[PDB]
C-alpha cells in the first residue's frame, strides 16, 4: 500500500574504495519498499549470476543472501533480480526473445533461480529494444514471463513473483522499441529511468534529470525532461500508478569551453574530469558532488528546470539535491504516479558523513519522507547549499 520506494543496488559498488565502499549491510531495511539487485546475467540462454561473489558457496555468504537478509529485519521488504543494464548489451536479449523456445528456456530457468535464492521478482533492463522485431518480441517475453509467474504462483501456493522493467525516457527509443499498452499491461510496475537526459555525448551543458526543460532548449530538446517523459508514457497507454519515477543519486558532468560561460546550454569541450571513487569521466556520485560543494564549488539553482548544478573552475555538474528531490516527490504526488525509483542506493550519502547534514541517506530519506511520511530523524535538516557553498 502507498507510494513505492524502489532502490537499485549495484554489486560493483562492492569494489569502491574509502568513502566509496558500499556493502548490502549499509542499506537500512526500512529505507526502501523494494530493492533491485543489479545485475543478474545470462548463461547459455538461462538466468545466472554475474560472478561467484553474488552466490553463496562453502560457508561464504554471497551478495544475494546479504541483500535478502534485510528482509529478516523488514519482512515487508521486496527484492527483485535485474537482468540487463549497460554492460549486458542487446544481442543476448535479441537471442533470448527471438523464438518461443529461447524465451521459454529463459523463463523456466528464471523461476527456480529466483525461488531458490529468495528473490520476490524479476526486473528486465533491456537497453534497449529497437526495431519492429525487438518491439514485438519484447512484448512476447514480458507476456510469457507474466503468464508463467501467474501459473507458478497458483501451483506452489506462494505470493506471485513480480515482473518489472527499467524503461527509457527518450521519445525515439520509446517509439522504436516499446509497445507501451501491452508492456504496461504485462508488468506489475514500471521503473522509468528518469535520468541521463543529458551528458558528455552532447556539445553543450545539460542537466542529468531536469524536471522541466530550460527555455534555451530547442523544440526537440524540450522533450527531454522528467515531466514530458512520464506524461509521454501515460499518453502511450501506461497507467499512472504503475509508473515509478527514477531519481539519480548521481550527476552528469562537463568541462566548460569557457569557465565564464557556466549556465545550462553553455559550450562544453567534453565530459567532466573523473571522480575519485566512481572513476568515470562525465559521471559523479552524489557524495562526490557534495565534496565539490564543500571545497570551493559554486551552487546554482535552476528554477526553470527545478534542479541544481555545481560549478568548480571549468567543471560543471548537473545533479539532484534534497530540494530538487523533494520538489520531484511533490510532483510525483501531484501527478498520481506510483512512487520513486532510485539509481542508486549506493551513491547517496549512505554513511551520512560526507555532505555535512549528518543524515544517512539524505536523498532517499527525503523521498521516503515526502511519499510515505517517515521522518529521517529529529534533527535531520536538508543541506542549504546556497548558504553553504559559493555563489556565481
Numbering used by the authors: 91 to 482
What text does the study give?
Here, we report an arthropod-conserved insect chitinase belonging to group III from the pest Ostrinia furnacalis (OfChtIII), which contains two GH18 domains that act without synergism according to enzymatic assays and structural investigations. OfChtIII contains 987 amino-acid residues and is composed of four domains: a predicted TM domain (residues 7–29), two catalytic domains, GH18A (residues 94–461) and GH18B (residues 530–889), and a CBM14 domain (residues 922–976). The two GH18 domains of OfChtIII possess similar structures and substrate specificities, which differentiate them from the chitinolytic chitinase OfChtI-CAD. The degradation activity of GH18A and GH18B (or GH18B-CBM14) in combination towards EGC was equal to the activity calculated from the sum of the individual activities, suggesting that there was no synergistic effect between them.
GH18A crystallized in space group P41212, and the structure was determined by molecular replacement using human AMCase as a template. The structures of the complexes were determined by molecular replacement using GH18A as a template. These structures were resolved to resolutions of between 2.0 and 3.0 Å and all data-collection and structure-refinement statistics are summarized in Table 2. A unique loop (residues 145–152) is adjacent to the α7 helix. Additionally, a substrate-binding groove with lined-up aromatic residues is located on the surface. Secondly, the structures of GH18A and GH18B are very similar, with an r.m.s.d. of 0.88 Å for 344 Cα atoms. Although the overall structures of GH18A and GH18B are similar to that of OfChtI-CAD, with r.m.s.d.s of 1.3 Å (for 367 Cα atoms) and 1.5 Å (for 360 Cα atoms), respectively, there are obvious differences between the two enzymes. Firstly, GH18A and GH18B from OfChtIII do not have the same surface hydrophobic planes as found in the GH18 domain of OfChtI (characterized by Phe159, Phe194, Trp241 and Tyr290). As calculated by the CASTp software with default parameters, the volumes of the substrate-binding clefts of OfChtI-CAD, GH18A and GH18B were estimated to be 1628, 1399 and 1100 Å3, respectively.
